Design an enzyme around this catalytic site. Structure first.
Site, mmCIF file in Angstrom:
data_model
loop_
_atom_site.group_PDB
_atom_site.id
_atom_site.type_symbol
_atom_site.label_atom_id
_atom_site.label_comp_id
_atom_site.label_asym_id
_atom_site.label_seq_id
_atom_site.Cartn_x
_atom_site.Cartn_y
_atom_site.Cartn_z
ATOM 1 N N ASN A 48 0.866 -1.177 0.000
ATOM 2 C CA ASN A 48 0.000 0.000 0.000
ATOM 3 C C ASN A 48 0.907 1.232 0.000
ATOM 4 O O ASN A 48 1.996 1.208 0.577
ATOM 5 C CB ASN A 48 -0.897 0.029 1.244
ATOM 6 C CG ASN A 48 -1.912 1.180 1.220
ATOM 7 O OD1 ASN A 48 -2.270 1.720 2.267
ATOM 8 N ND2 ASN A 48 -2.392 1.538 0.028
ATOM 9 N N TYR A 105 -6.781 13.730 -1.931
ATOM 10 C CA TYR A 105 -6.684 13.017 -0.662
ATOM 11 C C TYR A 105 -6.259 13.929 0.491
ATOM 12 O O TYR A 105 -5.451 14.841 0.305
ATOM 13 C CB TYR A 105 -5.699 11.853 -0.873
ATOM 14 C CG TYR A 105 -5.257 11.072 0.344
ATOM 15 C CD1 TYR A 105 -4.186 11.505 1.125
ATOM 16 C CD2 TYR A 105 -5.864 9.861 0.671
ATOM 17 C CE1 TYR A 105 -3.727 10.748 2.199
ATOM 18 C CE2 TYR A 105 -5.414 9.096 1.741
ATOM 19 C CZ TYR A 105 -4.346 9.546 2.500
ATOM 20 O OH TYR A 105 -3.907 8.798 3.561
ATOM 21 N N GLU A 152 -9.749 10.427 7.253
ATOM 22 C CA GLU A 152 -8.993 10.294 6.008
ATOM 23 C C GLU A 152 -10.069 10.441 4.936
ATOM 24 O O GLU A 152 -11.035 9.669 4.927
ATOM 25 C CB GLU A 152 -8.340 8.909 5.911
ATOM 26 C CG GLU A 152 -7.540 8.681 4.625
ATOM 27 C CD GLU A 152 -6.974 7.275 4.526
ATOM 28 O OE1 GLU A 152 -7.752 6.313 4.695
ATOM 29 O OE2 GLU A 152 -5.756 7.130 4.272
ATOM 30 N N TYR A 189 -11.405 11.156 0.716
ATOM 31 C CA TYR A 189 -11.118 10.961 -0.697
ATOM 32 C C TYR A 189 -12.129 11.598 -1.646
ATOM 33 O O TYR A 189 -13.332 11.584 -1.394
ATOM 34 C CB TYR A 189 -11.115 9.468 -1.049
ATOM 35 C CG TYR A 189 -10.095 8.593 -0.363
ATOM 36 C CD1 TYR A 189 -10.246 8.214 0.976
ATOM 37 C CD2 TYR A 189 -9.016 8.072 -1.079
ATOM 38 C CE1 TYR A 189 -9.346 7.330 1.577
ATOM 39 C CE2 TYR A 189 -8.116 7.191 -0.491
ATOM 40 C CZ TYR A 189 -8.284 6.822 0.834
ATOM 41 O OH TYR A 189 -7.390 5.940 1.399
ATOM 42 N N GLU A 210 -2.755 6.474 -5.243
ATOM 43 C CA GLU A 210 -2.677 5.465 -4.203
ATOM 44 C C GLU A 210 -2.835 4.100 -4.850
ATOM 45 O O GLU A 210 -3.659 3.920 -5.742
ATOM 46 C CB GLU A 210 -3.762 5.677 -3.136
ATOM 47 C CG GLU A 210 -4.115 4.390 -2.377
ATOM 48 C CD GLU A 210 -4.740 4.628 -1.011
ATOM 49 O OE1 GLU A 210 -5.567 5.551 -0.867
ATOM 50 O OE2 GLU A 210 -4.410 3.874 -0.077
#
Ligand SMILES: *[C@@H]1O[C@H](CO)[C@@H](O[C@@H]2O[C@H](CO)[C@@H](O[C@@H]3O[C@H](CO[C@H]4O[C@H](CO)[C@@H](O)[C@H](O)[C@@H]4O)[C@@H](O)[C@H](O)[C@@H]3O)[C@H](O)[C@H]2NC(C)=O)[C@H](O)[C@H]1NC(C)=O
Length: 197
Positions: free
Chosen positions: A46, A78, A87, A89, A176
């Site tokens: 990741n 992000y 977090e 997106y 990502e």
């Protein structure tokens, strides 16, 4: 310096940048002039990398990119907030996996419609160490690799859906990947030259 392969953040040509991965040697980020950067990865674990700002805001950002995922990967605005730790997106394009979960409705902005989802991430790495936190998602219905993102409209949409943000930390147009391969070249910028609050 320009070719990053170790956890690192900093400033390049006025733009904040961040690089993080739990899989050393499987991905690199190359910083270019202006607000551009590239990534290349292969059978990685990741990682999240991109250029942007160290303090997020209701910015109106324009980007252009070459996104070539081979498996699971995202081309997305992000960012993070603190207290609460979140977090978030704004997914513009993706590879084989499309983010999903509890449907919270939709938001129409910048010539497209995005599905809104909220999920939990357990005992995962964050700007505050190993933590469990919520994830806010805006996923475009039509993939695209260039255009404008009026971030403010997403924040408003999330808020109206009971998804409350905390104090903004960094905000970047990122690439990502997750157990996949691929490459990307992304160019981002803000409208005009207002500076950073
Ligand atoms: C950047 O900093 C990262 C920390 O945020 C570093 O991530 C660590 O990367 C190493 C590989 O270099 C991983 O080590 C493997 O760990 C697994 C077990 O993973 C599980 O347990 C850890 C416990 O901390 C947990 O964090 C994971 O989520 C899993 O639940 C072993 O099976 C392997 O043999 C190997 O030891 C770490 O797991 C990983 N930690 C984190 C926080 O993700 C990263 O290495 C740094 N990047 C660079 C390029 O140095």
């Amino acid at each position: 310096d320009t070719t990053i392969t170790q956890n690192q953040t900093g400033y390049d040509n006025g733009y904040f940048y961040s690089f993080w991965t739990d899989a050393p040697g499987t991905v690199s980020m190359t910083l270019h002039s202006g607000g551009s950067y590239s990534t290349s990865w292969r059978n990685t674990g990741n990682f999240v990398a991109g250029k942007g700002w160290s303090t997020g805001g209701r910015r109106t950002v324009t980007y252009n990119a070459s996104f070539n995922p081979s498996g699971n990967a995202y081309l997305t605005l992000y960012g993070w907030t603190r207290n609460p730790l979140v977090e978030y997106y704004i997914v513009e394009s993706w590879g084989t996996y499309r983010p999903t979960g509890t449907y919270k409705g939709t938001v129409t902005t910048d010539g497209g419609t995005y599905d809104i989802y909220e999920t939990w991430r357990y005992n995962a790495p964050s700007i505050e160490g190993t933590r469990t936190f919520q994830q806010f998602w805006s996923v475009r219905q039509q993939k695209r690799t260039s255009g404008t993102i009026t971030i403010g409209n997403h924040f408003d949409a999330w808020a109206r859906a009971g998804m409350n943000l905390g104090s903004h930390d960094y905000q970047i147009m990122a690439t990502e990947g997750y157990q996949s391969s691929g490459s990307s070249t992304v160019s981002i910028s803000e409208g005009g030259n207002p500076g950073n609050p």
